[PDB]
Design a protein around this nucleic acid. Structure first.
Ligand code: AKG
Ligand code: MN
Length: 266
DNA sequence: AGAATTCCGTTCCA
DNA sequence: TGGAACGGAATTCT
């Protein structure tokens, strides 16, 4: 119900001035139409209403930032058993929001205190361009969430993918169904141009992501999976918000403690 | 103690 | 519907 050529011109205009980069060979498709099979460049997916359900902007992060974060991420993850980590709040399995167990650890500290305040700026950049509805929602959240995660997004996921790990949750095709808003994704580490791509299975679209790129898309609606890497290290951050952020209460404590607090108020 | 297993609890889907 | 799934443990075995 709208012109895609003009909408792309609008999005490109905002993104060019905001990120101060020229995005060549940018493309736009409606969600109903046939998506590009291979996206190495700027790409946008919209509905009939005009809202952006996917945005991919190549290399918006300064190389100095990607390299420093990578080195620290790899340093911390070495001393970690699990291949995933989380900062901010999680409502998973509980009818309340709770502080992640990792926030007290080295990973959670580095994300919240150092990484997130810097990344929060590029998130602000991204949202003011592609989605107004998202940032309008994120600023309505409890102040405690913003203070906790030091970011507009109340929750941050840390995905460490080493070569030939098929057991990682991002290696299995899925949807994140708790998400009330499209997530913002940042990538780090080093891996090849032909591997570690995010594939949307139902739309048959392969987005090839490299360190420094940003990806903004709905995780609940579109089933997606991360491809295997034969070399390098694939590290990425997922900034999201669940439904429980608005709906469920907050006791300002970790999971087990909050459960005790939750019951005693009932 | 340091392994394997069960548990609390929400949400979904083949 | 059983059971896996962006958690995070406590029990229960060797
Ligand atoms: O890292 C990616 O490219 C995707 C992450 C993802 O799908 C998830 O965290 O569920
Ligand atoms: Mn996902």
């Amino acid at each position: 119900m709208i012109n895609k050529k003009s909408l792309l011109q609008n999005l490109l205009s905002k993104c060019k001035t905001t990120f101060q980069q020229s995005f060549t060979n940018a493309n736009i498709t409606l969600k109903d139409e046939k998506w590009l099979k291979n996206v190495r460049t700027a790409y946008f997916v919209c509905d009939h209403d005009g809202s952006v359900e996917l945005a991919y902007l190549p290399n918006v992060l300064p190389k100095e930032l990607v390299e420093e974060f990578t080195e620290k991420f790899e340093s911390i993850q070495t001393g970690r058993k699990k291949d995933t980590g989380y900062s901010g709040i999680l409502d998973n399995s509980m009818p309340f929001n709770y502080v992640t167990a990792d926030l007290s650890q080295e990973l959670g500290q580095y994300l919240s205190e150092i990484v997130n305040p810097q990344i929060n700026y590029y998130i602000s950049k991204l949202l003011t361009c592609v989605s107004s509805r998202t940032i309008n929602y994120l600023v309505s959240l409890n102040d405690s969430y913003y203070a906790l995660n030091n970011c507009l997004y109340p929750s941050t996921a840390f995905n460490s993918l080493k070569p030939s790990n098929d057991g990682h949750r991002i290696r299995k095709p899925h949807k994140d169904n708790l998400d009330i808003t499209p997530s913002s994704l940042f990538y780090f580490g080093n891996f090849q141009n032909t591997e570690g791509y995010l594939e949307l299975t139902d739309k048959n679209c392969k987005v090839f992501v490299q360190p420094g790129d940003v990806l903004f898309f709905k995780g609940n609606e579109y089933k997606h999976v991360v491809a295997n890497i034969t070399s390098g290290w694939r590290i990425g951050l997922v900034y999201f918000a669940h439904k429980g952020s608005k709906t469920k209460p907050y006791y300002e404590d970790t999971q087990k403690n909050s459960l005790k607090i939750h019951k005693e108020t009932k």
